[PDB]
PDB file of all heavy atoms in Angstrom:
ATOM      1  N   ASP M   1     -72.740  25.913 -11.096  1.00 22.96           N
ATOM      2  CA  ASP M   1     -73.373  27.250 -11.373  1.00 22.96           C
ATOM      3  C   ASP M   1     -72.978  27.670 -12.755  1.00 22.96           C
ATOM      4  O   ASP M   1     -71.873  28.023 -13.040  1.00 22.96           O
ATOM      5  CB  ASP M   1     -72.983  28.372 -10.363  1.00 22.96           C
ATOM      6  CG  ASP M   1     -73.831  29.643 -10.544  1.00 22.96           C
ATOM      7  OD1 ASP M   1     -74.552  29.762 -11.591  1.00 22.96           O
ATOM      8  OD2 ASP M   1     -73.819  30.521  -9.647  1.00 22.96           O
ATOM      9  N   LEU M   2     -73.951  27.681 -13.654  1.00 22.13           N
ATOM     10  CA  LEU M   2     -73.695  27.924 -15.075  1.00 22.13           C
ATOM     11  C   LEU M   2     -74.202  29.282 -15.469  1.00 22.13           C
ATOM     12  O   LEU M   2     -74.389  29.580 -16.700  1.00 22.13           O
ATOM     13  CB  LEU M   2     -74.422  26.853 -15.930  1.00 22.13           C
ATOM     14  CG  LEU M   2     -73.946  25.464 -15.848  1.00 22.13           C
ATOM     15  CD1 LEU M   2     -74.932  24.616 -16.707  1.00 22.13           C
ATOM     16  CD2 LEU M   2     -72.512  25.360 -16.332  1.00 22.13           C
ATOM     17  N   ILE M   3     -74.459  30.152 -14.566  1.00 21.64           N
ATOM     18  CA  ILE M   3     -74.885  31.547 -14.849  1.00 21.64           C
ATOM     19  C   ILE M   3     -73.930  32.184 -15.894  1.00 21.64           C
ATOM     20  O   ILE M   3     -74.413  33.023 -16.693  1.00 21.64           O
ATOM     21  CB  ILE M   3     -74.991  32.371 -13.589  1.00 21.64           C
ATOM     22  CG1 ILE M   3     -75.674  33.724 -13.971  1.00 21.64           C
ATOM     23  CG2 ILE M   3     -73.587  32.669 -12.903  1.00 21.64           C
ATOM     24  CD1 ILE M   3     -76.343  34.357 -12.746  1.00 21.64           C
ATOM     25  N   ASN M   4     -72.675  31.893 -15.868  1.00 21.92           N
ATOM     26  CA  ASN M   4     -71.713  32.565 -16.817  1.00 21.92           C
ATOM     27  C   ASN M   4     -71.304  31.657 -17.996  1.00 21.92           C
ATOM     28  O   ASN M   4     -70.254  31.982 -18.653  1.00 21.92           O
ATOM     29  CB  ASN M   4     -70.460  33.065 -16.062  1.00 21.92           C
ATOM     30  CG  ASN M   4     -70.719  34.289 -15.244  1.00 21.92           C
ATOM     31  OD1 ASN M   4     -71.546  35.143 -15.581  1.00 21.92           O
ATOM     32  ND2 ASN M   4     -69.930  34.510 -14.253  1.00 21.92           N
ATOM     33  N   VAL M   5     -72.014  30.581 -18.319  1.00 20.11           N
ATOM     34  CA  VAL M   5     -71.551  29.668 -19.306  1.00 20.11           C
ATOM     35  C   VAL M   5     -71.572  30.268 -20.739  1.00 20.11           C
ATOM     36  O   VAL M   5     -70.863  29.743 -21.582  1.00 20.11           O
ATOM     37  CB  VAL M   5     -72.439  28.369 -19.350  1.00 20.11           C
ATOM     38  CG1 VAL M   5     -73.671  28.587 -20.087  1.00 20.11           C
ATOM     39  CG2 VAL M   5     -71.661  27.196 -19.911  1.00 20.11           C
ATOM     40  N   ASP M   6     -72.339  31.284 -20.950  1.00 20.42           N
ATOM     41  CA  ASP M   6     -72.417  31.926 -22.206  1.00 20.42           C
ATOM     42  C   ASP M   6     -71.734  33.275 -22.300  1.00 20.42           C
ATOM     43  O   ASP M   6     -72.199  34.236 -22.926  1.00 20.42           O
ATOM     44  CB  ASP M   6     -73.832  32.064 -22.693  1.00 20.42           C
ATOM     45  CG  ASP M   6     -73.994  32.279 -24.242  1.00 20.42           C
ATOM     46  OD1 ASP M   6     -72.985  32.380 -24.895  1.00 20.42           O
ATOM     47  OD2 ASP M   6     -75.117  32.459 -24.780  1.00 20.42           O
ATOM     48  N   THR M   7     -70.577  33.398 -21.579  1.00 22.99           N
ATOM     49  CA  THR M   7     -69.758  34.572 -21.581  1.00 22.99           C
ATOM     50  C   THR M   7     -68.332  34.152 -21.858  1.00 22.99           C
ATOM     51  O   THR M   7     -68.028  32.934 -21.796  1.00 22.99           O
ATOM     52  CB  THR M   7     -69.795  35.338 -20.245  1.00 22.99           C
ATOM     53  OG1 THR M   7     -69.081  34.510 -19.288  1.00 22.99           O
ATOM     54  CG2 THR M   7     -71.222  35.441 -19.683  1.00 22.99           C
ATOM     55  N   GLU M   8     -67.508  35.168 -22.094  1.00 21.60           N
ATOM     56  CA  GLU M   8     -66.092  34.909 -22.345  1.00 21.60           C
ATOM     57  C   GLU M   8     -65.315  34.183 -21.326  1.00 21.60           C
ATOM     58  O   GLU M   8     -64.554  33.289 -21.638  1.00 21.60           O
ATOM     59  CB  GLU M   8     -65.430  36.311 -22.736  1.00 21.60           C
ATOM     60  CG  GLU M   8     -63.942  36.210 -22.946  1.00 21.60           C
ATOM     61  CD  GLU M   8     -63.348  37.504 -23.541  1.00 21.60           C
ATOM     62  OE1 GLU M   8     -64.117  38.114 -24.384  1.00 21.60           O
ATOM     63  OE2 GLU M   8     -62.250  37.918 -23.144  1.00 21.60           O
ATOM     64  N   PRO M   9     -65.338  34.548 -19.982  1.00 16.78           N
ATOM     65  CA  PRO M   9     -64.704  33.746 -18.973  1.00 16.78           C
ATOM     66  C   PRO M   9     -65.302  32.330 -18.717  1.00 16.78           C
ATOM     67  O   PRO M   9     -64.665  31.447 -18.163  1.00 16.78           O
ATOM     68  CB  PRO M   9     -64.849  34.635 -17.682  1.00 16.78           C
ATOM     69  CG  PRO M   9     -65.981  35.446 -17.925  1.00 16.78           C
ATOM     70  CD  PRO M   9     -65.978  35.743 -19.400  1.00 16.78           C
ATOM     71  N   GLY M  10     -66.527  32.095 -19.224  1.00 17.71           N
ATOM     72  CA  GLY M  10     -67.210  30.836 -19.058  1.00 17.71           C
ATOM     73  C   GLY M  10     -67.593  30.440 -17.637  1.00 17.71           C
ATOM     74  O   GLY M  10     -67.511  31.300 -16.731  1.00 17.71           O
ATOM     75  N   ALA M  11     -68.002  29.198 -17.450  1.00 16.11           N
ATOM     76  CA  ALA M  11     -68.372  28.715 -16.136  1.00 16.11           C
ATOM     77  C   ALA M  11     -67.298  27.779 -15.570  1.00 16.11           C
ATOM     78  O   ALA M  11     -66.669  27.005 -16.288  1.00 16.11           O
ATOM     79  CB  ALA M  11     -69.699  27.981 -16.183  1.00 16.11           C
ATOM     80  N   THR M  12     -67.124  27.875 -14.213  1.00 15.22           N
ATOM     81  CA  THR M  12     -66.116  27.054 -13.538  1.00 15.22           C
ATOM     82  C   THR M  12     -66.723  25.958 -12.735  1.00 15.22           C
ATOM     83  O   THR M  12     -67.582  26.187 -11.884  1.00 15.22           O
ATOM     84  CB  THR M  12     -65.268  27.991 -12.649  1.00 15.22           C
ATOM     85  OG1 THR M  12     -64.457  28.845 -13.389  1.00 15.22           O
ATOM     86  CG2 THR M  12     -64.237  27.096 -11.925  1.00 15.22           C
ATOM     87  N   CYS M  13     -66.346  24.751 -13.074  1.00 15.40           N
ATOM     88  CA  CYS M  13     -66.929  23.507 -12.399  1.00 15.40           C
ATOM     89  C   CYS M  13     -65.825  22.792 -11.762  1.00 15.40           C
ATOM     90  O   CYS M  13     -64.630  23.015 -12.080  1.00 15.40           O
ATOM     91  CB  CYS M  13     -67.616  22.682 -13.447  1.00 15.40           C
ATOM     92  SG  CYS M  13     -68.893  23.585 -14.335  1.00 15.40           S
ATOM     93  N   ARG M  14     -66.150  21.887 -10.825  1.00 16.08           N
ATOM     94  CA  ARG M  14     -65.213  21.055 -10.099  1.00 16.08           C
ATOM     95  C   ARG M  14     -65.682  19.637  -9.907  1.00 16.08           C
ATOM     96  O   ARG M  14     -66.869  19.355  -9.760  1.00 16.08           O
ATOM     97  CB  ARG M  14     -64.972  21.653  -8.666  1.00 16.08           C
ATOM     98  CG  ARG M  14     -64.427  23.092  -8.683  1.00 16.08           C
ATOM     99  CD  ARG M  14     -64.151  23.772  -7.302  1.00 16.08           C
ATOM    100  NE  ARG M  14     -64.467  25.200  -7.290  1.00 16.08           N
ATOM    101  CZ  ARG M  14     -63.646  26.139  -7.747  1.00 16.08           C
ATOM    102  NH1 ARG M  14     -62.475  25.825  -8.298  1.00 16.08           N
ATOM    103  NH2 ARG M  14     -64.056  27.416  -7.625  1.00 16.08           N
ATOM    104  N   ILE M  15     -64.703  18.669  -9.972  1.00 16.02           N
ATOM    105  CA  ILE M  15     -65.026  17.269  -9.886  1.00 16.02           C
ATOM    106  C   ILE M  15     -64.096  16.717  -8.842  1.00 16.02           C
ATOM    107  O   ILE M  15     -62.853  16.889  -8.902  1.00 16.02           O
ATOM    108  CB  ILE M  15     -64.710  16.570 -11.261  1.00 16.02           C
ATOM    109  CG1 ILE M  15     -65.658  17.064 -12.341  1.00 16.02           C
ATOM    110  CG2 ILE M  15     -64.964  15.060 -11.162  1.00 16.02           C
ATOM    111  CD1 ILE M  15     -65.411  16.453 -13.729  1.00 16.02           C
ATOM    112  N   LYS M  16     -64.632  16.106  -7.766  1.00 16.16           N
ATOM    113  CA  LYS M  16     -63.859  15.651  -6.644  1.00 16.16           C
ATOM    114  C   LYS M  16     -63.791  14.117  -6.655  1.00 16.16           C
ATOM    115  O   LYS M  16     -64.857  13.531  -6.640  1.00 16.16           O
ATOM    116  CB  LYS M  16     -64.496  16.130  -5.324  1.00 16.16           C
ATOM    117  CG  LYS M  16     -63.720  15.893  -4.113  1.00 16.16           C
ATOM    118  CD  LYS M  16     -64.403  16.566  -2.848  1.00 16.16           C
ATOM    119  CE  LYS M  16     -63.704  16.274  -1.553  1.00 16.16           C
ATOM    120  NZ  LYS M  16     -64.569  16.476  -0.365  1.00 16.16           N
ATOM    121  N   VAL M  17     -62.617  13.538  -6.674  1.00 15.97           N
ATOM    122  CA  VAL M  17     -62.488  12.098  -6.794  1.00 15.97           C
ATOM    123  C   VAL M  17     -61.581  11.542  -5.758  1.00 15.97           C
ATOM    124  O   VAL M  17     -60.474  12.057  -5.574  1.00 15.97           O
ATOM    125  CB  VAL M  17     -61.845  11.693  -8.170  1.00 15.97           C
ATOM    126  CG1 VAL M  17     -61.701  10.200  -8.314  1.00 15.97           C
ATOM    127  CG2 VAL M  17     -62.675  12.255  -9.353  1.00 15.97           C
ATOM    128  N   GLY M  18     -61.946  10.434  -5.170  1.00 16.61           N
ATOM    129  CA  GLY M  18     -61.137   9.770  -4.086  1.00 16.61           C
ATOM    130  C   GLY M  18     -61.695   8.464  -3.690  1.00 16.61           C
ATOM    131  O   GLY M  18     -62.816   8.108  -4.100  1.00 16.61           O
ATOM    132  N   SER M  19     -60.991   7.761  -2.817  1.00 16.80           N
ATOM    133  CA  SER M  19     -61.507   6.466  -2.337  1.00 16.80           C
ATOM    134  C   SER M  19     -62.605   6.804  -1.377  1.00 16.80           C
ATOM    135  O   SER M  19     -62.493   7.664  -0.522  1.00 16.80           O
ATOM    136  CB  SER M  19     -60.425   5.774  -1.573  1.00 16.80           C
ATOM    137  OG  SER M  19     -61.016   4.689  -0.813  1.00 16.80           O
ATOM    138  N   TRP M  20     -63.723   6.073  -1.439  1.00 17.60           N
ATOM    139  CA  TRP M  20     -64.859   6.268  -0.554  1.00 17.60           C
ATOM    140  C   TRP M  20     -64.576   5.640   0.861  1.00 17.60           C
ATOM    141  O   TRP M  20     -65.100   6.217   1.823  1.00 17.60           O
ATOM    142  CB  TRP M  20     -66.127   5.580  -1.076  1.00 17.60           C
ATOM    143  CG  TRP M  20     -67.379   6.088  -0.387  1.00 17.60           C
ATOM    144  CD1 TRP M  20     -68.262   5.307   0.333  1.00 17.60           C
ATOM    145  CD2 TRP M  20     -67.971   7.378  -0.477  1.00 17.60           C
ATOM    146  NE1 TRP M  20     -69.318   6.080   0.735  1.00 17.60           N
ATOM    147  CE2 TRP M  20     -69.136   7.351   0.264  1.00 17.60           C
ATOM    148  CE3 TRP M  20     -67.550   8.559  -1.077  1.00 17.60           C
ATOM    149  CZ2 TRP M  20     -69.985   8.480   0.362  1.00 17.60           C
ATOM    150  CZ3 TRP M  20     -68.407   9.710  -0.970  1.00 17.60           C
ATOM    151  CH2 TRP M  20     -69.581   9.595  -0.237  1.00 17.60           C
ATOM    152  N   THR M  21     -63.801   4.608   0.959  1.00 18.95           N
ATOM    153  CA  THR M  21     -63.680   3.935   2.216  1.00 18.95           C
ATOM    154  C   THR M  21     -62.251   3.575   2.589  1.00 18.95           C
ATOM    155  O   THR M  21     -62.037   2.866   3.597  1.00 18.95           O
ATOM    156  CB  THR M  21     -64.467   2.637   2.232  1.00 18.95           C
ATOM    157  OG1 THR M  21     -64.028   1.758   1.135  1.00 18.95           O
ATOM    158  CG2 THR M  21     -65.964   2.908   2.021  1.00 18.95           C
ATOM    159  N   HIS M  22     -61.226   3.946   1.808  1.00 15.82           N
ATOM    160  CA  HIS M  22     -59.835   3.729   2.193  1.00 15.82           C
ATOM    161  C   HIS M  22     -59.146   5.026   2.564  1.00 15.82           C
ATOM    162  O   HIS M  22     -58.910   5.874   1.734  1.00 15.82           O
ATOM    163  CB  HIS M  22     -59.040   2.965   1.109  1.00 15.82           C
ATOM    164  CG  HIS M  22     -59.586   1.575   0.831  1.00 15.82           C
ATOM    165  ND1 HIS M  22     -60.506   1.321  -0.203  1.00 15.82           N
ATOM    166  CD2 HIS M  22     -59.357   0.391   1.443  1.00 15.82           C
ATOM    167  CE1 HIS M  22     -60.738   0.009  -0.216  1.00 15.82           C
ATOM    168  NE2 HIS M  22     -60.090  -0.529   0.781  1.00 15.82           N
ATOM    169  N   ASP M  23     -58.948   5.280   3.896  1.00 13.93           N
ATOM    170  CA  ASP M  23     -58.289   6.491   4.304  1.00 13.93           C
ATOM    171  C   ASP M  23     -56.839   6.498   3.941  1.00 13.93           C
ATOM    172  O   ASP M  23     -56.374   5.480   3.400  1.00 13.93           O
ATOM    173  CB  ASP M  23     -58.518   6.734   5.799  1.00 13.93           C
ATOM    174  CG  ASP M  23     -57.796   5.706   6.685  1.00 13.93           C
ATOM    175  OD1 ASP M  23     -56.792   5.141   6.331  1.00 13.93           O
ATOM    176  OD2 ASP M  23     -58.296   5.426   7.834  1.00 13.93           O
ATOM    177  N   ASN M  24     -56.172   7.623   4.191  1.00 13.40           N
ATOM    178  CA  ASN M  24     -54.846   7.802   3.625  1.00 13.40           C
ATOM    179  C   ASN M  24     -53.738   6.994   4.276  1.00 13.40           C
ATOM    180  O   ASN M  24     -52.601   6.931   3.761  1.00 13.40           O
ATOM    181  CB  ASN M  24     -54.516   9.339   3.435  1.00 13.40           C
ATOM    182  CG  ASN M  24     -53.816   9.858   4.700  1.00 13.40           C
ATOM    183  OD1 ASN M  24     -52.755  10.467   4.485  1.00 13.40           O
ATOM    184  ND2 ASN M  24     -54.398   9.657   5.883  1.00 13.40           N
ATOM    185  N   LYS M  25     -54.053   6.304   5.389  1.00 12.27           N
ATOM    186  CA  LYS M  25     -53.166   5.324   5.972  1.00 12.27           C
ATOM    187  C   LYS M  25     -53.084   4.058   5.203  1.00 12.27           C
ATOM    188  O   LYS M  25     -52.200   3.258   5.353  1.00 12.27           O
ATOM    189  CB  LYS M  25     -53.611   4.956   7.351  1.00 12.27           C
ATOM    190  CG  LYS M  25     -53.475   6.088   8.367  1.00 12.27           C
ATOM    191  CD  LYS M  25     -54.190   5.852   9.698  1.00 12.27           C
ATOM    192  CE  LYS M  25     -54.022   7.058  10.629  1.00 12.27           C
ATOM    193  NZ  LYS M  25     -53.955   6.603  12.041  1.00 12.27           N
ATOM    194  N   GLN M  26     -54.049   3.869   4.308  1.00 10.60           N
ATOM    195  CA  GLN M  26     -54.128   2.638   3.523  1.00 10.60           C
ATOM    196  C   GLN M  26     -53.900   2.898   2.014  1.00 10.60           C
ATOM    197  O   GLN M  26     -53.368   2.031   1.309  1.00 10.60           O
ATOM    198  CB  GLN M  26     -55.395   1.839   3.798  1.00 10.60           C
ATOM    199  CG  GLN M  26     -55.313   0.994   5.103  1.00 10.60           C
ATOM    200  CD  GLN M  26     -56.645   0.331   5.347  1.00 10.60           C
ATOM    201  OE1 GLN M  26     -57.407  -0.102   4.453  1.00 10.60           O
ATOM    202  NE2 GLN M  26     -56.965   0.182   6.675  1.00 10.60           N
ATOM    203  N   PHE M  27     -54.425   4.046   1.612  1.00 11.95           N
ATOM    204  CA  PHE M  27     -54.634   4.265   0.176  1.00 11.95           C
ATOM    205  C   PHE M  27     -54.121   5.707  -0.043  1.00 11.95           C
ATOM    206  O   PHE M  27     -54.706   6.696   0.281  1.00 11.95           O
ATOM    207  CB  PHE M  27     -56.120   4.228  -0.092  1.00 11.95           C
ATOM    208  CG  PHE M  27     -56.511   4.400  -1.600  1.00 11.95           C
ATOM    209  CD1 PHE M  27     -57.053   3.321  -2.290  1.00 11.95           C
ATOM    210  CD2 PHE M  27     -56.525   5.691  -2.097  1.00 11.95           C
ATOM    211  CE1 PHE M  27     -57.484   3.557  -3.591  1.00 11.95           C
ATOM    212  CE2 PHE M  27     -56.966   5.929  -3.424  1.00 11.95           C
ATOM    213  CZ  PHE M  27     -57.500   4.795  -4.193  1.00 11.95           C
TER     214      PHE M  27
END
């Protein structure tokens, strides 16, 4: 959501990264 990209506080974005197929018992 870039509604605030042109203001002082700016826009907040998120990037989620992880293994697609190795659960936490393996990876």
Side-chain angles (χ1 to χ4, degrees):
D1 189 349
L2 290 178
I3 192 158
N4 285 333
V5 82
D6 200 0
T7 69
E8 179 169 323
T12 292
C13 304
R14 302 182 215 280
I15 296 178
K16 189 174 176 199
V17 181
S19 165
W20 197 246
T21 59
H22 296 96
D23 64 31
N24 92 126
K25 291 166 182 216
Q26 282 176 32
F27 183 114

